[PDB]
Design an enzyme around this catalytic site. Sequence first.
Site, PDB file in Angstrom:
ATOM      1  N   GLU A 145      81.952 -59.029  42.970  1.00  0.00           N
ATOM      2  CA  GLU A 145      82.809 -58.193  42.107  1.00  0.00           C
ATOM      3  C   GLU A 145      82.041 -57.009  41.529  1.00  0.00           C
ATOM      4  O   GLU A 145      82.272 -56.597  40.402  1.00  0.00           O
ATOM      5  CB  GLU A 145      83.433 -59.032  40.991  1.00  0.00           C
ATOM      6  CG  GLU A 145      84.386 -60.076  41.508  1.00  0.00           C
ATOM      7  CD  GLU A 145      85.645 -59.463  42.007  1.00  0.00           C
ATOM      8  OE1 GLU A 145      85.871 -58.289  41.666  1.00  0.00           O
ATOM      9  OE2 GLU A 145      86.419 -60.160  42.726  1.00  0.00           O
ATOM     10  N   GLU A 153      82.453 -57.005  54.138  1.00  0.00           N
ATOM     11  CA  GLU A 153      82.066 -57.180  55.527  1.00  0.00           C
ATOM     12  C   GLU A 153      80.555 -57.368  55.580  1.00  0.00           C
ATOM     13  O   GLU A 153      79.833 -57.011  54.628  1.00  0.00           O
ATOM     14  CB  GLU A 153      82.460 -55.921  56.302  1.00  0.00           C
ATOM     15  CG  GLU A 153      83.983 -55.665  56.280  1.00  0.00           C
ATOM     16  CD  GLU A 153      84.419 -54.418  56.947  1.00  0.00           C
ATOM     17  OE1 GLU A 153      83.548 -53.569  57.322  1.00  0.00           O
ATOM     18  OE2 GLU A 153      85.658 -54.237  57.060  1.00  0.00           O
ATOM     19  N   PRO A 154      80.049 -57.830  56.707  1.00  0.00           N
ATOM     20  CA  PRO A 154      78.605 -58.007  56.832  1.00  0.00           C
ATOM     21  C   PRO A 154      77.798 -56.760  56.420  1.00  0.00           C
ATOM     22  O   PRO A 154      76.766 -56.881  55.724  1.00  0.00           O
ATOM     23  CB  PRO A 154      78.443 -58.320  58.314  1.00  0.00           C
ATOM     24  CG  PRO A 154      79.703 -58.990  58.675  1.00  0.00           C
ATOM     25  CD  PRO A 154      80.778 -58.288  57.902  1.00  0.00           C
ATOM     26  N   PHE A 199      76.252 -42.586  42.722  1.00  0.00           N
ATOM     27  CA  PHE A 199      76.223 -43.621  43.746  1.00  0.00           C
ATOM     28  C   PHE A 199      75.458 -43.149  44.968  1.00  0.00           C
ATOM     29  O   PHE A 199      74.756 -43.933  45.615  1.00  0.00           O
ATOM     30  CB  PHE A 199      77.618 -44.060  44.154  1.00  0.00           C
ATOM     31  CG  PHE A 199      78.412 -44.675  43.025  1.00  0.00           C
ATOM     32  CD1 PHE A 199      78.426 -46.035  42.847  1.00  0.00           C
ATOM     33  CD2 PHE A 199      79.101 -43.886  42.113  1.00  0.00           C
ATOM     34  CE1 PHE A 199      79.119 -46.593  41.758  1.00  0.00           C
ATOM     35  CE2 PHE A 199      79.790 -44.464  41.041  1.00  0.00           C
ATOM     36  CZ  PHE A 199      79.807 -45.807  40.898  1.00  0.00           C
ATOM     37  N   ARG A 219      85.734 -71.852  38.919  1.00  0.00           N
ATOM     38  CA  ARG A 219      86.382 -70.668  38.381  1.00  0.00           C
ATOM     39  C   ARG A 219      86.593 -69.625  39.504  1.00  0.00           C
ATOM     40  O   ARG A 219      87.606 -68.897  39.501  1.00  0.00           O
ATOM     41  CB  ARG A 219      85.570 -70.071  37.235  1.00  0.00           C
ATOM     42  CG  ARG A 219      86.293 -69.055  36.329  1.00  0.00           C
ATOM     43  CD  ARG A 219      86.215 -67.599  36.768  1.00  0.00           C
ATOM     44  NE  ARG A 219      84.836 -67.206  36.972  1.00  0.00           N
ATOM     45  CZ  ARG A 219      84.301 -66.639  38.042  1.00  0.00           C
ATOM     46  NH1 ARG A 219      85.038 -66.189  39.067  1.00  0.00           N
ATOM     47  NH2 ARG A 219      82.997 -66.446  38.061  1.00  0.00           N
ATOM     48  N   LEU A 259      64.288 -77.365  28.181  1.00  0.00           N
ATOM     49  CA  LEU A 259      64.402 -78.754  28.671  1.00  0.00           C
ATOM     50  C   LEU A 259      63.157 -79.288  29.334  1.00  0.00           C
ATOM     51  O   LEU A 259      63.073 -80.496  29.609  1.00  0.00           O
ATOM     52  CB  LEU A 259      65.572 -78.903  29.642  1.00  0.00           C
ATOM     53  CG  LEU A 259      66.913 -78.363  29.201  1.00  0.00           C
ATOM     54  CD1 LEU A 259      68.010 -78.634  30.270  1.00  0.00           C
ATOM     55  CD2 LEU A 259      67.336 -78.788  27.829  1.00  0.00           C
ATOM     56  N   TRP A 266      81.404 -63.406  53.346  1.00  0.00           N
ATOM     57  CA  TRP A 266      81.272 -63.883  51.967  1.00  0.00           C
ATOM     58  C   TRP A 266      82.621 -64.086  51.283  1.00  0.00           C
ATOM     59  O   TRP A 266      82.759 -63.797  50.102  1.00  0.00           O
ATOM     60  CB  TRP A 266      80.357 -62.966  51.120  1.00  0.00           C
ATOM     61  CG  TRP A 266      79.051 -62.624  51.760  1.00  0.00           C
ATOM     62  CD1 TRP A 266      78.663 -61.399  52.269  1.00  0.00           C
ATOM     63  CD2 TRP A 266      77.967 -63.518  52.022  1.00  0.00           C
ATOM     64  NE1 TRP A 266      77.439 -61.503  52.840  1.00  0.00           N
ATOM     65  CE2 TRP A 266      76.969 -62.777  52.693  1.00  0.00           C
ATOM     66  CE3 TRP A 266      77.721 -64.864  51.700  1.00  0.00           C
ATOM     67  CZ2 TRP A 266      75.755 -63.344  53.088  1.00  0.00           C
ATOM     68  CZ3 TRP A 266      76.521 -65.423  52.090  1.00  0.00           C
ATOM     69  CH2 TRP A 266      75.543 -64.653  52.769  1.00  0.00           C
TER      70      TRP A 266
END
Lengths: 387, 387, 387, 387
Positions: free
Chosen positions: B366, B136-137, B386, B93, B341, B165
């Site tokens: 995101e 960015e890093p 922030f 996806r 499980l 990434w």
Amino acid sequence: RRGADDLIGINAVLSAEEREIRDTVRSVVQRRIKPHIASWYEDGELPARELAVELGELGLLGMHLKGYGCAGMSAVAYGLACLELEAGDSGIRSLVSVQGSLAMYAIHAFGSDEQKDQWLPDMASGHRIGCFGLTEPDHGSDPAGMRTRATRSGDDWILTGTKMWITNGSVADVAVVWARTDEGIRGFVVPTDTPGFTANTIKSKMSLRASVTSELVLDGVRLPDSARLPGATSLGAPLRCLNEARFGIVFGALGAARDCLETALAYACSREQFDRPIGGFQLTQQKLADMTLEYGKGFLLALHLGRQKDAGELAPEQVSLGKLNNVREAIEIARTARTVLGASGITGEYPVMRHANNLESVLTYEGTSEMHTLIIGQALTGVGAFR
Amino acid sequence: RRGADDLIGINAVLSAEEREIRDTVRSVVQRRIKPHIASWYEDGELPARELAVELGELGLLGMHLKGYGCAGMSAVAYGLACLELEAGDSGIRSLVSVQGSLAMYAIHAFGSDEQKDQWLPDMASGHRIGCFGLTEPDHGSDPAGMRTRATRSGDDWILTGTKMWITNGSVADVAVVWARTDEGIRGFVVPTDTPGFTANTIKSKMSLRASVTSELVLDGVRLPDSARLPGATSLGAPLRCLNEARFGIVFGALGAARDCLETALAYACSREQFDRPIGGFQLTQQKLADMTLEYGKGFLLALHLGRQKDAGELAPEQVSLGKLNNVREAIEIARTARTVLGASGITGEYPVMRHANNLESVLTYEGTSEMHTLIIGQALTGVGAFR
Amino acid sequence: RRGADDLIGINAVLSAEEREIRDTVRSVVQRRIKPHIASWYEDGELPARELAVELGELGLLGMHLKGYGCAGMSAVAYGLACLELEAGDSGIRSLVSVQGSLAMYAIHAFGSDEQKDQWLPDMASGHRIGCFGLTEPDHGSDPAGMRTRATRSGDDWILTGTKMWITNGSVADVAVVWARTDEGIRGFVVPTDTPGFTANTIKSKMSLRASVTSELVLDGVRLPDSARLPGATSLGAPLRCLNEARFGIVFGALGAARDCLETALAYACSREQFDRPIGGFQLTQQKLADMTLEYGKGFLLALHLGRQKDAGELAPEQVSLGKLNNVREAIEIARTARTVLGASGITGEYPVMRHANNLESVLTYEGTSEMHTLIIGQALTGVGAFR
Amino acid sequence: RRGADDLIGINAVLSAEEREIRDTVRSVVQRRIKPHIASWYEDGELPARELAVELGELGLLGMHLKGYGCAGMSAVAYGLACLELEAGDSGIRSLVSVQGSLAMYAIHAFGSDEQKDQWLPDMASGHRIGCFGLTEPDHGSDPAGMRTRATRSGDDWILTGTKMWITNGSVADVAVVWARTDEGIRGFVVPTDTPGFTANTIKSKMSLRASVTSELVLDGVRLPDSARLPGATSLGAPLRCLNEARFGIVFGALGAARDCLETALAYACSREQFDRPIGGFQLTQQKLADMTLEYGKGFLLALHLGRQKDAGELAPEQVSLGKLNNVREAIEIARTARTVLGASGITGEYPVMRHANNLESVLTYEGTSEMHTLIIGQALTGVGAFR
Ligand SMILES: Cc1cc2c(cc1C)N(C[C@H](O)[C@H](O)[C@H](O)COP(=O)(O)OP(=O)(O)OC[C@H]1O[C@@H](n3cnc4c(N)ncnc43)[C@H](O)[C@@H]1O)c1[nH]c(=O)[nH]c(=O)c1N2
Ligand SMILES: Cc1cc2c(cc1C)N(C[C@H](O)[C@H](O)[C@H](O)COP(=O)(O)OP(=O)(O)OC[C@H]1O[C@@H](n3cnc4c(N)ncnc43)[C@H](O)[C@@H]1O)c1[nH]c(=O)[nH]c(=O)c1N2
Ligand SMILES: Cc1cc2c(cc1C)N(C[C@H](O)[C@H](O)[C@H](O)COP(=O)(O)OP(=O)(O)OC[C@H]1O[C@@H](n3cnc4c(N)ncnc43)[C@H](O)[C@@H]1O)c1[nH]c(=O)[nH]c(=O)c1N2
Ligand SMILES: Cc1cc2c(cc1C)N(C[C@H](O)[C@H](O)[C@H](O)COP(=O)(O)OP(=O)(O)OC[C@H]1O[C@@H](n3cnc4c(N)ncnc43)[C@H](O)[C@@H]1O)c1[nH]c(=O)[nH]c(=O)c1N2
Ligand SMILES: [Cl-]
Ligand SMILES: [Cl-]
Ligand SMILES: [Cl-]
Ligand SMILES: [Cl-]
Ligand SMILES: [Cl-]
Ligand SMILES: [Cl-]
Ligand SMILES: [Cl-]
Ligand SMILES: [Cl-]
């Protein structure tokens, strides 16, 4: 900045002897395990036989047992050792738990003198590897329902069944195998070269990849009566072994937690975002405080249980307090720590994902969280709720 | 036994057109993704270029965009498609999200007609792969702080920096790269064969292993002014792209949750322990009820947001409700399902560990959970927190 | 600043008819309930008889029933009404739930024409108050085990037993009482002036203090056969009534949540500490985001269930999703909101503690959280786990 | 059935001296507090002056202080005393905390010999009651921002301001009042009969109803310089007092938890439903196990902190670990316990709702959960995040 151990004040509630053992094992982990573990885990392969020798010759196999070349250390010192081993990796600590607290313990506790003298010194040195065959494909949480059978044939026994999820199984020289008989559960010392015995390595693991986990097939394995553990006459025998191993896990899980917490603490001080260290944001501090609390409460619980164990005061329902709490709180610490690392946390550059995935097995094995809840519940109420 | 979708009553709140698209994508996933995904994930390698062509030719790239060979489907139908894709695998996806809602969307929204006509039809068919270079890093959650720069040189631009990434980066033909300039943030359509541009694949991933994730090095990459996205004049341009992609994730995360919940439900009915199906124990039912609740609440939230989006009524703080909620609740569902499980849950025999590990990346990318909390918080209070 | 309803977008998924009913009930609450409720709650006394008349004459008793002077409104409109009533106070909504969805519903669904014609119009106007006697001192979650008995004596019935925790009991003109007989569970329309019938008010309540809650003692109460509800022939009859009442609670609990969330949102914007509004701190925003999410998910779940109910598509296990979720999430919202108010939150200056304490009763009554978990569990697995 | 203390093994980690003090205070609580507390709480009125004398003459005021008729007991013994008092009621423990660890402590630590000799022996006997005026209507979590001022007038001081939420204020003979001056924060010993000083009792409380909580109005109260606490020269003075009081709360909150847990355990064994004790159901056992774990971890944390305090090793960030953890875990225990009691849990027949409501004040006062999170966070990271 105060580290978590400093803030909790751990050294002050340990002895110099205990701290020395802890420090010795930490050094072994830093030197012999940490440089290789990312690769072993990724590959799902490790030099288990060579590693067992290394650890045994270092005095790390059978640590809590007395005699036969074993360290004979206290419950608290053994716990601290397990914590350090698991801070390295839970798979590595698992190899040790099975060797000492399951396979050797079973022989030590229920074996004949012949079995003890034959097996224990070479197990303590790591030259012979053991495994503990209790779980089966269809019976895990309910070992009373096990279907591996041992039937008499003249003076011999014939063992028929399959054991599953057996740590060290494919590299084991000896298997302590539990079976149902016409007179109840019994245990057998099974050389793995016995005809009819095969071990198959389980692959595609997403947890505990730096450990060997196996299926054991006992396809009518013929053993003399002298292979039977004479002192094991009920389900209580394997359960006593589990309670020894569980104790080590009470401490061990905290090592994985610690390694993750220390990782998150260091990162929170080094990584900047929005023009400050991310440790300077309230939401980051909430995580660091919460994790430190559960690590510290878990450590104080473990230490309390160890002090009780050394005093002779430790019941299975008490061990279950530690196992239930420390494993689920450890895995939550690992998960939370990973979030603090952001994207960097998703690779083996950091140990957090390995720890979190490993702890899935630790959460399930040696009694699931639900099993421990019900053990504690039965103790509190006097009523079993397993059925 | 009622399944989760039946108990929630999902089909009755969708149209026949929506159900048809959903069913079509489910069939693609069952046929083209599920048979291979365990192997792709284990290997950390997949035929990404060949897969992009397959998906594009099936109409699955640029689904929510209009024109240029794209499907032009509704927000709700697109959401359902993402849910089905992620029920296959979040990595798969992700390839689609980056292609359509990030790289194509950026060109569609801010590009010149020349850029749209050159790139979009071949991107919709999967013959050219895009990536979206924002992170960015040192700058992830705070892209306003990005340090990749674009400087003028005559009529050209020189782009210098590193992006990190970046999904699809190593297999991309084109990179939509965001940079700071003397007049604010700008975006560039960067052919990946441009001299000075290199892409390096990130290895040792413990999440999203069936996706390509890369470092992009822009070592003084020279581009004509015609490479600039003319409509992108501030940080709001890349943020609009993120809000498109986030919407698809609101639905997508629920697919991973569903697959895990369905797995746990089936297992709870088939696996017996203590002489009953484990689904007959209260602690198992608690898990199944809790998971079904969060899946259903998450689906109703996603559908509500999609209906708003189609009506033209959908703000970023509303998307954040869905992204914050559905990803963290999905990962909790995966984790809980794995416990049901038992040991079987630790291998790729079942999809749960893959889903849980994949969702670590989805939780972070995101916009992290913390970022979405603060977006919602600012909307509720009128005050940014922030900084 | 966007309010929670605005951020969720509630008005756009309701009809004008639904919004009108909602608005009408909100105005009744603001005018007739909110000015007095702090005093009624503190005193543990309210003019219940006078209030019933007021509410009945306003069309608020029997809202979801058809005929006999009742409003005949849709499930969704009824739900919205309950939400508004409970935003006032859960005790007040409880008086209404018992009147309409329990006592009137039972008569409407299972009564003879004589019973309906005698009782329902005066119940709809509030001039006669009903109660619903199911629970007993020793039987609450398991009403199948009820021990109140009805025995035949000639053409009469003799009812003997005690009901406990019965809302409206001490002010009721009529009691719908459930009893075991030799041929199964039966229900009776019991005028409260019948010899042998007494009602005692329960005091020292720490929850639901603005409601009347009673013990009913049926000390060999003699009734004609015409007092029996002819249509009620099993435990399923009282359970159908509970499922009607539960539906109203699915919406109602969200009103208490809303009132608390709105209180916390307003306070977070007005109260300053450390030189900013407390809503400007990350930890405050986390709470406000989390609460808004659970309120909104809960509302979307309630609306979905109401739309299903109007379409004829709503089963008890679906109602249980809403009841399990919305009550526990509401009480968590109330608790979290109180923390945002600091010390100011501990008095009746604000409604939060009243709401939180009231919700304790709502969490327990009409099936505890555990009962709803097991109802959903049985639906998901096909296996009952009550025993 | 094993009780929680027995399962944890508490007596074995205490001394005989510590157990004796604990037992003595438990007996006082059982005899002098428990028979009356339901009535005092309901009424919101208690004979506070007479009770102070009783407690003082029993040696329970100023327990951790040395000299002046005070007990001079260890930190651990004092902690155990607070735990027993709060198991009675948090309001009662609050009266004691303010008397000893706030008002007396301030005088003991910062007072002149004249102040100590005048006030402390009569405070230790309970014949004079103190209060601690730090909080104001607009300044609670941020006492650095306090606006009560002390201004010089010749050799006198004039104190002007309002303090709010002041425990014991309306029954106090002496108030230790904190004020801003031109040279920093100062503290004053304020006889409450001084002209200009009034105290108003706060009513409509939904928490801590068995405590007196007041507004103090200092309307230009004129005091000699000899009223100033000479040793208090900064905000650190009142903060040292808070850290003493917080320590007692670390233990105290566990008493309320214990009382609730013991209540739930007894009820789970006595109450039957569906033909078994409710303690025989898995969901009940889950609650009992979880509560017992948090009680025991909280106790081990408290004991650890007390042992550190006696050893001279206890910092404010360490106290915050205990305060943050033990109060929020106590209130969760109370809430969970109430659910186990079903409807019976909603009246004062059982102590659970009183404890849960009381703990709301304990959660907020002496630093909110958020304040303690940030204290711990700052210690861990070296970075303050209050602003
Ligand atoms: C990597 C690794 C390594 C090892 C092992 C496992 C793993 C993953 N184990 C096996 C381990 O002990 C085993 O997995 C657990 O006992 C759980 O059993 P099952 O996996 O069969 O789950 P099982 O099928 O028992 O349970 C499935 C789920 O149902 C729940 N459940 C079961 N009964 C319930 C009940 N009555 N009430 C409520 N819930 C219930 C469980 O808690 C679980 O969530 C093992 N074994 C061994 O003998 N030797 C070894 O060396 C190892 N090593
Ligand atoms: C597999 C995969 C794939 C992709 C991506 C990631 C991953 C893992 N991303 C990058 C992704 O968007 C990025 O990881 C996130 O924005 C988070 O940024 P950082 O990882 O730098 O964490 P960062 O360093 O920003 O944050 C670290 C931690 O601190 C917290 N934090 C930061 N600021 C805070 C604040 N002000 N207050 C409170 N907490 C705060 C964060 O929430 C997080 O927990 C990407 N990017 C891209 O451009 N294109 C792509 O295709 C992809 N794809
Ligand atoms: C203020 C108020 C008002 C009303 C009512 C209650 C209250 C508090 N009720 C009664 C209400 O319906 C009743 O309290 C609940 O059904 C719960 O029953 P008990 O309180 O007896 O708890 P009960 O004793 O059934 O349960 C005790 C605890 O054990 C748990 N438990 C029980 N069985 C279990 C199982 N099999 N597995 C796991 N856990 C289990 C429960 O969930 C609960 O936590 C009522 N009734 C009525 O008839 N008419 C009315 O008007 C009202 N109104
Ligand atoms: C019954 C009772 C009894 C007493 C007291 C209270 C109560 C309820 N107190 C007062 C008590 O110490 C006070 O309530 C707390 O310090 C909290 O202050 P406020 O109530 O003003 O909340 P305040 O307005 O400070 O905080 C409101 C909310 O915002 C949060 N918040 C504030 N600043 C924040 C930040 N920087 N970041 C994140 N969140 C933040 C808080 O955690 C809280 O949730 C007291 N006082 C006294 O002097 N003497 C006494 O005897 C008593 N006794
Ligand atoms: Cl061992
Ligand atoms: Cl049992
Ligand atoms: Cl897309
Ligand atoms: Cl900001
Ligand atoms: Cl109604
Ligand atoms: Cl059942
Ligand atoms: Cl004190
Ligand atoms: Cl600060």
